[PDB]
């Protein structure tokens, strides 16, 4: 049925987003270095451990990668979707919402920023400490 398809979408998609964390840091570094090189005209001398940490932070700054996807649909088909994908979506931690603007039988995917209280509570543990030069 359609069930497998939509569930495999959410399955596959989220899964791909997950794979990013393990495999995407070094990849973005190699690119960052190429960019630098092509611009400056020579390979610069850069601390790799330092640099690769800078990217992980950059990554943590994209809610889509750091948080979970938000599937928001039309209120009319709202109940219909949640009945179909509700179980599969919850497992992967996806929020779901109706969007008044979206047309009947239509769908839009954004990266949810969650709750203000949560975002704040998280920053304290990060802001709590300071490194040394």
């Amino acid at each position: 049925p359609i069930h497998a398809r939509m569930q495999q979408l959410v399955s596959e998609f989220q899964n791909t987003l997950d794979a990013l964390d393990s495999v995407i840091a070094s990849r973005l570094m190699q690119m960052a270095l190429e960019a630098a090189r092509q611009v400056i005209g020579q390979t610069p001398a850069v601390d790799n451990s330092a640099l690769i940490k800078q990217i992980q932070q950059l990554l943590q700054q994209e809610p889509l990668f750091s948080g979970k996807p938000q599937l928001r649909v039309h209120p009319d088909d709202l109940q219909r979707v949640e009945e179909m994908l509700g179980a599969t979506l919850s497992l992967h931690g996806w929020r779901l919402r109706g969007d008044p603007t979206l047309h009947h039988g239509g769908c839009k995917v954004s990266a949810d920023e969650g709750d203000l209280d949560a975002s704040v509570a998280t920053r304290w543990q990060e802001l709590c400490r300071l490194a040394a030069p």
Binding site: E12, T16, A19, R27, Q30, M31, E34, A35, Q38, G41
Partner: protein, 445 residues
């Protein structure tokens, strides 16, 4: 990792594009602005070159787009695509093949000559680009016209027959139902893709055409390039230029496209502004010689592709303004075209729509596309028609009686059916069969 591989690939392909980036960028200097045309020096460029002029915003340095329309061997004559207000004496100038979005992505979309979205949606996903400038298809390696192209308009299909790859004119005037006729075709024409260039058309009418004429029906199978009357003539020409380029690509994919250029008059008029600005005397009508080098060029791009290929069948609207044929563009159009659909003002004011002059119109590929039994019927239809319109008065006074004139007698007996056959309606579709079979209900067999 189907999706994952897409991402990595996307990334990998960008890192290879880095190798390309230019080490150094040369600047010229804008020497003179006294008028629409600007003079720069320090860099030498080909005609059509897009030239950027740097304007200082304070901390921000904005770019003013500009184009090379001419030169004195030392000087480069630039024309702007936007306002030069705020440019300093001796401002920096540099040159930036410009890539434009092509593909099934464009379907359902409204874009300008730049390729930018006019419908208030993001740029199309551009997996592929192309260049406005493409080496002209060599007609040597293209294929002839064997196939009727169903235009969904009965009068055309039956009486003036067109076939794939044929490039046809539409001559008309304001208020005769030109815009609608085009809509009807864009909706009912049987073809893989519909490209509609709207060039020089009024801004508000462009919206009227897309919202209320093309409809969602035809909006969905159509790609609409729009350069209105407010923009610079360079941008209008780009509009026709970009419209043709698209259709060309679609053709290269095995697709059969309908290309509607509204209008060829405006294209021409747009060249005239530019030509005059650069001091090219108006040799023919007060239309500079370039105008007539241009029209052939833009029209020859249409046609059938490789055999087992795909094709561009086009309609280039010419606005024949007032009672006319004095107009050289309409003549150049006639000379370079496969025949033309002529809209009658008399018919339009009579509520007869689409108002098409079966007399004035012609399609040269017609006899090649139809049966002699059909072609016989065609001629008759016209002769009966002609008989009626000349003598239509006397019939009213009761002046005419049978036995004197065989045509006018037949014609006037068939008139309500003929009149009904030629008339169609905005939402009325006439297929190939529908048209042919309609013919039989009258004459044969």
């Amino acid at each position: 990792t189907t999706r994952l591989t897409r991402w990595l690939t996307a990334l990998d392909n960008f890192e290879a594009k880095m190798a390309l980036l230019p080490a150094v960028r040369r600047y010229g200097r804008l020497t003179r602005a006294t008028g629409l045309v600007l003079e720069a020096t320090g860099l030498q460029l080909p005609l059509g070159a897009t030239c950027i002029i740097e304007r200082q915003d304070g901390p921000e340095t904005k770019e003013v787009e500009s184009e090379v329309v001419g030169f004195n061997g030392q000087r480069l004559f630039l024309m702007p695509l936007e306002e030069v207000e705020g440019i300093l004496p001796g401002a920096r100038v540099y040159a930036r093949g410009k890539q434009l979005p092509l593909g099934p992505a464009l379907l359902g979309r409204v874009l300008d000559g730049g390729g930018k979205p006019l419908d208030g949606l993001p740029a199309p996903d551009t997996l592929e680009t192309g260049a406005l400038i493409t080496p002209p298809f060599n007609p040597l390696q293209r294929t002839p016209i064997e196939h009727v192209l169903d235009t969904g308009v009965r009068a055309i299909n039956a009486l003036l027959t067109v076939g794939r790859g044929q490039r046809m004119g539409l001559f008309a005037g304001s208020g005769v139902g030109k815009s609608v006729l085009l809509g009807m075709m864009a909706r009912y024409t049987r073809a893989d893709v519909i490209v509609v260039g709207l060039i020089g058309e009024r801004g508000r009418e462009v919206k009227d055409f897309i919202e209320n004429i093309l409809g969602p029906d035809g909006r969905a199978r159509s790609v609409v390039i729009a350069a209105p009357a407010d923009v610079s003539p360079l941008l209008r020409m780009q509009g026709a230029a970009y419209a043709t380029r698209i259709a060309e690509d679609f053709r290269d994919r095995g697709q059969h496209v309908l290309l509607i250029m509204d209008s060829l008059t405006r294209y021409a008029m747009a060249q005239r502004e530019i030509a005059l600005a650069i001091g090219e005397p108006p040799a023919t009508k007060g239309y500079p010689p370039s105008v007539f080098a241009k029209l052939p060029a833009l029209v020859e791009r249409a046609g059938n592709g490789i055999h087992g290929g795909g094709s561009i069948t086009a309609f280039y609207t010419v606005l024949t303004e007032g009672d006319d044929q004095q107009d050289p563009i309409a003549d150049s159009a006639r000379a370079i075209l496969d025949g033309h659909i002529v809209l009658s003002r008399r018919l339009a004011e009579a509520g007869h729509y689409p108002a098409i002059d079966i007399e004035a119109s012609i399609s040269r590929a017609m006899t090649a596309l139809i049966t002699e039994q059909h072609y016989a019927r065609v001629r008759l239809f016209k002769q009966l028609l002609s008989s009626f319109q000349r003598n239509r008065d006397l019939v009213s006074v009761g002046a005419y009686a049978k036995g004197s004139d065989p045509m006018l007698d037949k014609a006037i007996t068939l008139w309500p059916q003929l009149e009904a056959f030629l008339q169609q309606g905005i939402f009325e579709r006439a297929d190939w069969e529908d048209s042919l079979q309609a013919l039989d209900l009258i004459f044969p067999t």
